[PDB]
Design an enzyme around this catalytic site. Structure first.
Site, PDB file in Angstrom:
ATOM      1  N   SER A 228       0.821  -1.167   0.000  1.00 27.70           N
ATOM      2  CA  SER A 228       0.000   0.000   0.000  1.00 27.70           C
ATOM      3  C   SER A 228       0.874   1.243   0.000  1.00 27.70           C
ATOM      4  O   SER A 228       1.765   1.382   0.844  1.00 27.70           O
ATOM      5  CB  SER A 228      -0.919   0.000   1.214  1.00 27.70           C
ATOM      6  OG  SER A 228      -1.508   1.279   1.380  1.00 27.70           O
TER       7      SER A 228
ATOM      8  N   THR B 129     -11.148   4.224 -18.373  1.00 31.68           N
ATOM      9  CA  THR B 129     -10.848   3.300 -17.314  1.00 31.68           C
ATOM     10  C   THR B 129     -12.129   2.831 -16.631  1.00 31.68           C
ATOM     11  O   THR B 129     -13.090   3.600 -16.521  1.00 31.68           O
ATOM     12  CB  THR B 129      -9.946   4.059 -16.391  1.00 31.68           C
ATOM     13  OG1 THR B 129      -8.611   3.650 -16.687  1.00 31.68           O
ATOM     14  CG2 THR B 129     -10.230   3.837 -14.974  1.00 31.68           C
TER      15      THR B 129
ATOM     16  N   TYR C 119      -9.118  15.095  -4.141  1.00 26.66           N
ATOM     17  CA  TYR C 119      -8.291  14.680  -5.284  1.00 26.66           C
ATOM     18  C   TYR C 119      -7.585  15.861  -5.958  1.00 26.66           C
ATOM     19  O   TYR C 119      -6.410  15.782  -6.332  1.00 26.66           O
ATOM     20  CB  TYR C 119      -9.217  14.009  -6.311  1.00 26.66           C
ATOM     21  CG  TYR C 119      -8.627  13.542  -7.607  1.00 26.66           C
ATOM     22  CD1 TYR C 119      -8.154  12.244  -7.745  1.00 26.66           C
ATOM     23  CD2 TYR C 119      -8.640  14.360  -8.737  1.00 26.66           C
ATOM     24  CE1 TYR C 119      -7.654  11.778  -8.969  1.00 26.66           C
ATOM     25  CE2 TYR C 119      -8.142  13.917  -9.964  1.00 26.66           C
ATOM     26  CZ  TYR C 119      -7.636  12.620 -10.076  1.00 26.66           C
ATOM     27  OH  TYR C 119      -7.144  12.151 -11.309  1.00 26.66           O
TER      28      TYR C 119
HETATM   29  N1  LIG Z   1      -9.005   7.532 -15.342  1.00 29.03           N
HETATM   30  C1  LIG Z   1      -9.135   8.901 -15.761  1.00 29.03           C
HETATM   31  O1  LIG Z   1     -10.390   9.386 -16.323  1.00 29.03           O
HETATM   32  C2  LIG Z   1      -8.059   9.812 -15.319  1.00 29.03           C
HETATM   33  C3  LIG Z   1      -6.930   9.252 -14.714  1.00 29.03           C
HETATM   34  N2  LIG Z   1      -5.896  10.044 -14.393  1.00 29.03           N
HETATM   35  C4  LIG Z   1      -4.728   9.504 -13.677  1.00 29.03           C
HETATM   36  O2  LIG Z   1      -4.304   8.242 -14.174  1.00 29.03           O
HETATM   37  C5  LIG Z   1      -3.759   7.431 -13.114  1.00 29.03           C
HETATM   38  C6  LIG Z   1      -4.355   6.023 -13.186  1.00 29.03           C
HETATM   39  O3  LIG Z   1      -5.765   6.094 -12.937  1.00 29.03           O
HETATM   40  P1  LIG Z   1      -6.814   4.951 -13.357  1.00 29.03           P
HETATM   41  O4  LIG Z   1      -6.205   3.885 -14.254  1.00 29.03           O
HETATM   42  O5  LIG Z   1      -8.063   5.642 -13.805  1.00 29.03           O
HETATM   43  O6  LIG Z   1      -7.179   4.387 -11.895  1.00 29.03           O
HETATM   44  P2  LIG Z   1      -7.592   2.875 -11.592  1.00 29.03           P
HETATM   45  O7  LIG Z   1      -8.545   2.816 -10.416  1.00 29.03           O
HETATM   46  O8  LIG Z   1      -7.956   2.132 -12.846  1.00 29.03           O
HETATM   47  O9  LIG Z   1      -6.179   2.354 -11.049  1.00 29.03           O
HETATM   48  C7  LIG Z   1      -5.651   2.662  -9.768  1.00 29.03           C
HETATM   49  C8  LIG Z   1      -4.403   1.807  -9.526  1.00 29.03           C
HETATM   50  O10 LIG Z   1      -3.762   2.309  -8.351  1.00 29.03           O
HETATM   51  C9  LIG Z   1      -3.740   1.310  -7.358  1.00 29.03           C
HETATM   52  N3  LIG Z   1      -3.921   1.892  -6.019  1.00 29.03           N
HETATM   53  C10 LIG Z   1      -5.007   2.546  -5.543  1.00 29.03           C
HETATM   54  N4  LIG Z   1      -4.830   2.886  -4.236  1.00 29.03           N
HETATM   55  C11 LIG Z   1      -3.609   2.456  -3.860  1.00 29.03           C
HETATM   56  C12 LIG Z   1      -2.864   2.481  -2.702  1.00 29.03           C
HETATM   57  N5  LIG Z   1      -3.341   3.042  -1.572  1.00 29.03           N
HETATM   58  N6  LIG Z   1      -1.629   1.924  -2.718  1.00 29.03           N
HETATM   59  C13 LIG Z   1      -1.091   1.309  -3.808  1.00 29.03           C
HETATM   60  N7  LIG Z   1      -1.760   1.248  -4.955  1.00 29.03           N
HETATM   61  C14 LIG Z   1      -3.004   1.799  -5.037  1.00 29.03           C
HETATM   62  C15 LIG Z   1      -4.913   0.349  -7.711  1.00 29.03           C
HETATM   63  O11 LIG Z   1      -4.873  -1.012  -7.231  1.00 29.03           O
HETATM   64  P3  LIG Z   1      -5.238  -1.438  -5.710  1.00 29.03           P
HETATM   65  O12 LIG Z   1      -6.477  -0.676  -5.216  1.00 29.03           O
HETATM   66  O13 LIG Z   1      -5.439  -2.926  -5.833  1.00 29.03           O
HETATM   67  O14 LIG Z   1      -4.042  -0.976  -4.919  1.00 29.03           O
HETATM   68  C16 LIG Z   1      -4.788   0.366  -9.222  1.00 29.03           C
HETATM   69  O15 LIG Z   1      -3.721  -0.545  -9.592  1.00 29.03           O
HETATM   70  C17 LIG Z   1      -4.108   8.143 -11.822  1.00 29.03           C
HETATM   71  O16 LIG Z   1      -2.957   8.801 -11.322  1.00 29.03           O
HETATM   72  C18 LIG Z   1      -5.132   9.185 -12.239  1.00 29.03           C
HETATM   73  O17 LIG Z   1      -5.237  10.304 -11.328  1.00 29.03           O
HETATM   74  C19 LIG Z   1      -5.934  11.366 -14.679  1.00 29.03           C
HETATM   75  C20 LIG Z   1      -7.017  11.953 -15.323  1.00 29.03           C
HETATM   76  C21 LIG Z   1      -8.096  11.162 -15.665  1.00 29.03           C
END
Ligand SMILES: NC(=O)C1=CN([C@@H]2O[C@H](COP(=O)(O)OP(=O)(O)OC[C@H]3O[C@@H](n4cnc5c(N)ncnc54)[C@H](OP(=O)(O)O)[C@@H]3O)[C@@H](O)[C@H]2O)C=CC1
Ligand SMILES: NC(=O)C1=CN([C@@H]2O[C@H](COP(=O)(O)OP(=O)(O)OC[C@H]3O[C@@H](n4cnc5c(N)ncnc54)[C@H](OP(=O)(O)O)[C@@H]3O)[C@@H](O)[C@H]2O)C=CC1
EC number: 1.1.1.146
Lengths: 274, 274
Positions: free
Chosen positions: B69, B197, B160
């Site tokens: 985490s 996503t 956020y």
């Molecule tokens: N999706 C969009 O419309 C947008 C996305 N972004 C950016 O793109 C990036 C990816 O986003 P997206 O693919 O949508 O998000 P997802 O929810 O698809 O992916 C999130 C990832 O981060 C991991 N994660 C979440 N919390 C924790 C934690 N506490 N510790 C370790 N790992 C963690 C999750 O897995 P797990 O919970 O199992 O740890 C997962 O692998 C982000 O930085 C986001 O801000 C920016 C603008 C728009």
């Protein structure tokens, strides 16, 4: 309420944080001259006592201090409650304190990052949350004191600039929500250039050589803009600089983006719960 | 090194965070097709396992996962060291994980504010600090995954947005200092619009109705911009949006403000200490 009049703070109940010296102390002074009720805070008991006594001298309706550290979130929440009690409410929350680090290249001092975020951003959030009900019943106002370094970046100071940038992202979004909602608590983001505060003058001494604006006037402009309920107030030592800091691009994009929500759902989910 | 070529990632040693789904997973696949060495992380052990096996299938030079985490700053610091040892070094650090809150009007959930700052910002900083010596010895690169909501504000999502704005204040200053200093570690801030996503499609479903760009291409554009060592990479679903997001004002004011330092003193204080 189109031009500022000193009379607008007459009898108003105001919190000022970081008010034992620098800009904060000046804000207290000006509020005391306007005859506001004032509750002043910072860590140093003796420094705040002096400010309190000076404010009664200058004509404050009432003046008190509560000493504590804004890195303790429990103190922050409980400070606001006590402050309300001593005044019987709250009209204006002036969020002013700040932790400064040394002007240095970042070398991985993650504790500076964390401490700056705690003192400069998280506590401003906690103060605002604790004060919100009183501000809502008085349709009051919050001053969020920031910096040019919260709109733009400067070498040295990355920890500080992270925390100030965070303030803009949080409070601007909050104002935007309050506007749709329609909360009638105003939030003024104060963008200050270099100010002739003693800590700032010492800090920048061999390092940054641009001119400094006076703290007394700075403090006045903060209260003007907050009382006049503006989104932003710029006090930056020039009239042309603020045009380059308020990026109209963001303004336009925020305007355009609003038409992209479904307001029918948003507004009825809000009335359902949360 | 003017146009991107997949070859530029062949045998390169890359950490990707948040890589079990969404954009992160897509980044790992693209890096695997390019034949990179990959260490992948997130909390879900079994989802990571699947991604690693797919990466080997797709042609990764090597592929490993460490689950944990990013709220835990100790894990973040120890994750980078283990990743380096699995790969014998590090050329690229892709900072992609994020905590998402429900899209709701802010009503005083200070824990959301804290947790968002922890996962989205503080951990980015800790990862970067832990990675920096390896990145300096490889003259490598950091991708800092952000958002349009890190350049501009959007109702719902204040916690956020504070975290994303923080990343800009921090890393943009860091880049500034690196250029002066002259570090040779590049820092690419990735400004993403709405991405298709699963988490994002669910989150925005009844609420925000603008078009979504594809995550597969999004992931590719993050690595092209980072490999090409760009300060910023825009993937926003429009060619004119980026013009409104990158305030030229900010850039001018940053350029003008530089001539305000006494660099002789700054650089010689750096050389004696810190
Ligand atoms: N999706 C969009 O419309 C947008 C996305 N972004 C950016 O793109 C990036 C990816 O986003 P997206 O693919 O949508 O998000 P997802 O929810 O698809 O992916 C999130 C990832 O981060 C991991 N994660 C979440 N919390 C924790 C934690 N506490 N510790 C370790 N790992 C963690 C999750 O897995 P797990 O919970 O199992 O740890 C997962 O692998 C982000 O930085 C986001 O801000 C920016 C603008 C728009
Ligand atoms: N001076 C300038 O050039 C600029 C100032 N600003 C902004 O103006 C505001 C005030 O600046 P300035 O007057 O120069 O600052 P000063 O250093 O003069 O005063 C800071 C005040 O905050 C208090 N404070 C510091 N740390 C803590 C803490 N951990 N808990 C509670 N209180 C604390 C201090 O009291 P004590 O130390 O006793 O606790 C003091 O009362 C800040 O928000 C700053 O970012 C913005 C741009 C420029």
């Amino acid at each position: 309420n189109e031009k500022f009049r000193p009379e607008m703070l007459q009898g108003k109940k105001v919190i000022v944080t970081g008010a034992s010296k620098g800009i904060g102390r000046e804000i207290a002074y000006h509020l005391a001259k306007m005859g506001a009720h004032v509750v002043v805070t910072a860590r140093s008991k003796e420094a705040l006592q002096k400010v309190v006594a000076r404010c009664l001298e200058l004509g404050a309706a009432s003046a008190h201090y509560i000493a504590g550290s804004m890195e303790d979130m429990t103190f922050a929440e409980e400070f606001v409650a006590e402050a309300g009690n001593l005044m019987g409410g709250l009209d204006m929350l002036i969020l002013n304190h700040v932790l400064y680090n040394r002007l240095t290249f970042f070398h991985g001092e993650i504790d500076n990052v964390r401490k700056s975020m705690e003192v400069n951003f998280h506590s401003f959030v906690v103060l605002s949350v604790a004060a919100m009900p009183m501000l809502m019943q008085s349709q009051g106002s919050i001053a969020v004191v920031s910096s040019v370094a919260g709109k733009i970046t400067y070498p040295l100071i990355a920890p500080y600039s992270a925390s100030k940038f965070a303030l803009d992202g949080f409070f601007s979004t909050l104002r935007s929500e309050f506007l749709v909602n329609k909360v009638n608590v105003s939030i003024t983001l104060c963008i200050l250039g270099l100010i002739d505060t003693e800590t700032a003058i010492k800090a920048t001494s061999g390092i940054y050589l641009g001119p400094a604006s006076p703290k007394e006037e700075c403090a006045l402009e903060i209260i003007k803009g907050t009382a006049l309920r503006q989104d932003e107030m710029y006090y930056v030592g020039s009239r042309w600089v603020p045009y380059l800091l308020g990026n109209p691009g963001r303004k336009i994009m925020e305007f355009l983006s609003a038409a992209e929500y479904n307001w029918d759902n948003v507004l009825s989910n809000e009335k359902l719960y949360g």
